[PDB]
Design an enzyme around this catalytic site. Sequence first.
Site, PDB file in Angstrom:
ATOM      1  N   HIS A  41       0.807  -1.221   0.000  1.00  0.00           N
ATOM      2  CA  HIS A  41       0.000   0.000   0.000  1.00  0.00           C
ATOM      3  C   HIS A  41       0.845   1.278   0.000  1.00  0.00           C
ATOM      4  CE1 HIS A  41       0.148  -0.289   4.610  1.00  0.00           C
ATOM      5  NE2 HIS A  41       0.525   0.957   4.381  1.00  0.00           N
ATOM      6  N   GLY A 143       3.436   6.161  10.266  1.00  0.00           N
ATOM      7  CA  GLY A 143       4.770   5.990   9.732  1.00  0.00           C
ATOM      8  C   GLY A 143       5.447   4.696  10.114  1.00  0.00           C
ATOM      9  N   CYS A 145       4.432   1.661   9.473  1.00  0.00           N
ATOM     10  CA  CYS A 145       4.210   0.572   8.523  1.00  0.00           C
ATOM     11  C   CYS A 145       5.521   0.098   7.910  1.00  0.00           C
ATOM     12  CB  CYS A 145       3.260   1.016   7.407  1.00  0.00           C
ATOM     13  SG  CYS A 145       1.560   1.145   7.948  1.00  0.00           S
TER      14      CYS A 145
HETATM   15  N1  LIG Z   1       0.004   1.506  13.362  1.00  0.00           N
HETATM   16  C1  LIG Z   1      -0.428   2.512  13.157  1.00  0.00           C
HETATM   17  C2  LIG Z   1      -1.013   3.866  12.895  1.00  0.00           C
HETATM   18  C3  LIG Z   1      -1.719   4.530  13.895  1.00  0.00           C
HETATM   19  C4  LIG Z   1      -2.264   5.788  13.653  1.00  0.00           C
HETATM   20  C5  LIG Z   1      -2.101   6.378  12.401  1.00  0.00           C
HETATM   21  C6  LIG Z   1      -1.400   5.713  11.402  1.00  0.00           C
HETATM   22  C7  LIG Z   1      -0.851   4.452  11.646  1.00  0.00           C
HETATM   23  C8  LIG Z   1      -0.081   3.719  10.579  1.00  0.00           C
HETATM   24  C9  LIG Z   1      -0.843   3.710   9.285  1.00  0.00           C
HETATM   25  N2  LIG Z   1      -0.084   2.974   8.283  1.00  0.00           N
HETATM   26  C10 LIG Z   1      -2.177   3.052   9.497  1.00  0.00           C
HETATM   27  O1  LIG Z   1      -2.231   1.908   9.951  1.00  0.00           O
HETATM   28  N3  LIG Z   1      -3.293   3.716   9.202  1.00  0.00           N
HETATM   29  C11 LIG Z   1      -4.610   3.117   9.405  1.00  0.00           C
HETATM   30  C12 LIG Z   1      -5.428   3.221   8.145  1.00  0.00           C
HETATM   31  C13 LIG Z   1      -5.008   2.212   7.111  1.00  0.00           C
HETATM   32  C14 LIG Z   1      -3.997   2.539   6.213  1.00  0.00           C
HETATM   33  C15 LIG Z   1      -3.602   1.614   5.253  1.00  0.00           C
HETATM   34  C16 LIG Z   1      -4.215   0.362   5.193  1.00  0.00           C
HETATM   35 CL1  LIG Z   1      -3.756  -0.817   4.016  1.00  0.00          CL
HETATM   36  C17 LIG Z   1      -5.221   0.037   6.083  1.00  0.00           C
HETATM   37  C18 LIG Z   1      -5.621   0.957   7.035  1.00  0.00           C
HETATM   38 CL2  LIG Z   1      -6.871   0.472   8.117  1.00  0.00          CL
HETATM   39  C19 LIG Z   1      -5.360   3.882  10.455  1.00  0.00           C
HETATM   40  O2  LIG Z   1      -5.268   5.108  10.495  1.00  0.00           O
HETATM   41  N4  LIG Z   1      -6.143   3.230  11.318  1.00  0.00           N
HETATM   42  C20 LIG Z   1      -6.932   3.916  12.345  1.00  0.00           C
HETATM   43  C21 LIG Z   1      -6.092   4.214  13.558  1.00  0.00           C
HETATM   44  C22 LIG Z   1      -6.965   4.728  14.728  1.00  0.00           C
HETATM   45  O3  LIG Z   1      -7.741   5.668  14.551  1.00  0.00           O
HETATM   46  N5  LIG Z   1      -6.852   4.076  16.057  1.00  0.00           N
HETATM   47  C23 LIG Z   1      -7.642   4.497  17.216  1.00  0.00           C
HETATM   48  C24 LIG Z   1      -7.595   3.395  18.237  1.00  0.00           C
HETATM   49  C25 LIG Z   1      -8.312   3.773  19.498  1.00  0.00           C
HETATM   50  C26 LIG Z   1      -7.749   4.706  20.363  1.00  0.00           C
HETATM   51  C27 LIG Z   1      -8.409   5.060  21.535  1.00  0.00           C
HETATM   52  C28 LIG Z   1      -9.631   4.473  21.844  1.00  0.00           C
HETATM   53  C29 LIG Z   1     -10.196   3.538  20.984  1.00  0.00           C
HETATM   54  C30 LIG Z   1      -9.534   3.188  19.811  1.00  0.00           C
HETATM   55  C31 LIG Z   1      -8.117   3.053  12.703  1.00  0.00           C
HETATM   56  C32 LIG Z   1      -8.998   2.915  11.493  1.00  0.00           C
HETATM   57  C33 LIG Z   1      -9.974   3.873  11.227  1.00  0.00           C
HETATM   58  C34 LIG Z   1     -10.791   3.757  10.104  1.00  0.00           C
HETATM   59  C35 LIG Z   1     -10.635   2.677   9.240  1.00  0.00           C
HETATM   60  F1  LIG Z   1     -11.433   2.557   8.136  1.00  0.00           F
HETATM   61  C36 LIG Z   1      -9.664   1.718   9.504  1.00  0.00           C
HETATM   62  C37 LIG Z   1      -8.848   1.837  10.625  1.00  0.00           C
END
Ligand SMILES: N#Cc1ccccc1C[C@@H](N)C(=O)N[C@H](Cc1ccc(Cl)cc1Cl)C(=O)N[C@H](CC(=O)NCCc1ccccc1)Cc1ccc(F)cc1
Lengths: 304, 304
Positions: A41, A143, A145
């Site tokens: 990705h 970052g 990943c």
């Molecule tokens: N590690 C890591 C990481 C963390 C933050 C930013 C960036 C990265 C790396 C980055 N690379 C990455 O993983 N970004 C994915 C998005 C993504 C990118 C690429 C691919 Cl292929 C797949 C995905 Cl899903 C990402 O932002 N996820 C968020 C993170 C989130 O809000 N957690 C809150 C937890 C929480 C906290 C408190 C209380 C309850 C819960 C959750 C989410 C939201 C909507 C969705 F639809 C799918 C997933």
Amino acid sequence: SGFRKMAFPSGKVEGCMVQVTCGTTTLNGLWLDDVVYCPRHVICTSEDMLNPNYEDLLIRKSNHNFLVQAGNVQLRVIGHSMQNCVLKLKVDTANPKTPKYKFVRIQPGQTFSVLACYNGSPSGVYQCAMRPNFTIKGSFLNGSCGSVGFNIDYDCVSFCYMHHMELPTGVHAGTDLEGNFYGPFVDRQTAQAAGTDTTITVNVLAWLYAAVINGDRWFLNRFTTTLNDFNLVAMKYNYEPLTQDHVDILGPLSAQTGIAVLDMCASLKELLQNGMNGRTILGSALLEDEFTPFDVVRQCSGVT
Amino acid sequence: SGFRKMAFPSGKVEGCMVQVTCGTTTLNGLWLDDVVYCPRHVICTSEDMLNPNYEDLLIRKSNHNFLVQAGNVQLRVIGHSMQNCVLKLKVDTANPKTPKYKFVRIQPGQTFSVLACYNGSPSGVYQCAMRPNFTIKGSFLNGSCGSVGFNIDYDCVSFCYMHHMELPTGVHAGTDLEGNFYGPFVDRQTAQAAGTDTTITVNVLAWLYAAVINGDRWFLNRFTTTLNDFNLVAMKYNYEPLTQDHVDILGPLSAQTGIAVLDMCASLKELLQNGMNGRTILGSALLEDEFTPFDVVRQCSGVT
Ligand SMILES: N#Cc1ccccc1C[C@@H](N)C(=O)N[C@H](Cc1ccc(Cl)cc1Cl)C(=O)N[C@H](CC(=O)NCCc1ccccc1)Cc1ccc(F)cc1
Ligand SMILES: N#Cc1ccccc1C[C@@H](N)C(=O)N[C@H](Cc1ccc(Cl)cc1Cl)C(=O)N[C@H](CC(=O)NCCc1ccccc1)Cc1ccc(F)cc1
Ligand SMILES: [Cl-]
Ligand SMILES: [Cl-]
């Protein structure tokens, strides 16, 4: 004596971490010989991420669309391919720091060390287990990943995890180094839920043996139990059923402490039924399940 | 998101670990430039250890009494000296892997990474704090002496601990890299007791802020307290008194979460008085005190 969450020394993996950039997207890659491995990705824009067709997105890329940086030295990309969810970038330079290594796909309950990295730069190392629901409870920021998980055995690095994404619940999902996800997950930015998780029973038992090896005996009792009776209780408290293979894996620890596995199961049953009542085990107030029998043997003395 | 016991990447220190042998005694040394640093009790026999006169024992040694091994390569010792409780061995070869480094003597409550080593070979890395009673709760076996503790800041390794001994209680004592013990201990094989230990209050508070940054808020309350009132309770539960300097160190975390330090102190007071009642914080069932405010900032996101 003492007992700590212990990772493998990370140096052999630090020398393999690089930064990969495609467009405005940057993450970490693993540089082994003349190939860089990273999450596919990296070829996605923010808009592409919601529903990517990766074959479509990759065919539109050339070698010069990829920027690889090792330290402040740019590596020239001379070829690229996709294997499941990992992108492979052939570079013109073999990594002189390449360790002896293997790619391994692990089972739930197994542990590994994670070298958390940002922009190709290692920032910290910690221990993780693969949960029964195929997530890991990592510590990862934007970052991260492309950070990898690994074990080390006689200077051979077995890579077992590459980080791809954080799920809505804040736990983490990724692939083996051949790009196959652990669990049912897919690399697109949609809300994916892991199955309900369970406690890793063989690891809790291993950790109880570590406590005995360290002279902590307060939780033992004179009772024993059968495998079938224990598993009834394991079900009740959301523990993985104990298998005969797991009983056998605990053999060495049982023999070093003189406590039969099924004896220790009776202590665990009592701990689950009555709690700790304010006491701790190896400095913990809950039952720890991210140490394997191997981890315990590796860290503890060979004599109780 | 997520929160883990996180060590620094150990590679820069792995390249400095060597094995030092004097007679039948072998332990670990640290090879920086053309000097090897190790515990001076390497010059002691088992009998010498009970009550050594180190000046007497060292005057009876020459350079050829010391064997230094880096990998399978022997380094020739060309000079030796004693500085407090560390032996310095000058060798004919400067370590080509010497990192940018400093020697630092830390305060109780500060954390560091430990690279546990055996026979000059790194085996694992974990996080430790210097306890208020100047011990560390390490994980160390026979042969671990001379393992070092360190922090890393922009590729400069600050060495702060060298391991010398395990006390009767199973905790660990050692020196800074200039050979001065932390605490009142001395390097002879007698039963030495540490003073009674206390909980590192500023670190517990830091870790509560980490939990809030990770969205864990169940322990908060609407109350606040004064510094003097909080410290009365800290005394009651064997917590270090909270100082105004520690209030100030927590500034950034307080500002990122919008929770004033003295507000968080009221939550901690309530946690100490009522316990957790079966709930966990950052996956822990007790109040964790081996993360500094710096550790929390380093590992957590800059946005709550
Ligand atoms: N590690 C890591 C990481 C963390 C933050 C930013 C960036 C990265 C790396 C980055 N690379 C990455 O993983 N970004 C994915 C998005 C993504 C990118 C690429 C691919 Cl292929 C797949 C995905 Cl899903 C990402 O932002 N996820 C968020 C993170 C989130 O809000 N957690 C809150 C937890 C929480 C906290 C408190 C209380 C309850 C819960 C959750 C989410 C939201 C909507 C969705 F639809 C799918 C997933
Ligand atoms: N790490 C380490 C390490 C660990 C084991 C072996 C070797 C080493 C490295 C090795 N280098 C080293 O530390 N050996 C010192 C001896 C020593 C050497 C050199 C010097 Cl300068 C000083 C000392 Cl004190 C050592 O054996 N200590 C023992 C260890 C012990 O029995 N723990 C039980 C805890 C416990 C367990 C369960 C329940 C309750 C308690 C405790 C002790 C006993 C008598 C005494 F008089 C002073 C200390
Ligand atoms: Cl296999
Ligand atoms: Cl100073």
